[PDB]
Amino acid sequence: MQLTKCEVFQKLKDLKDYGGVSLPEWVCTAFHTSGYDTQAIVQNNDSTEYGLFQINNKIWCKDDQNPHSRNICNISCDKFLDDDLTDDIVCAKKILDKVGINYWLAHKALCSEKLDQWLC
């Protein structure tokens, strides 16, 4: 589903302040990662990223391309292509705990300035 900013702000409520990352920061992160598209899928030469949070099949989730993924999130990647972000959020928390926000953002600044712009 292609979501609006406001739908993302609502749907991501359970990430609010997780690991110190504010809800606006998470909305900014989703914008820059997928454009709020829950079906986003992006391939590079050897791996694929899925969903709103572009979760990868190298270490985070298992899929056909990489059946021996480390699968830290213990889930099939295609569960990140549906319209229920409950599991996406569970795994995004695990990603934050392990790699931090730089999983998504080349530089933290991208989502630390004028954060009130990401509110509904």
Ligand SMILES: [Ca+2]
């Ligand atoms: Ca999902």
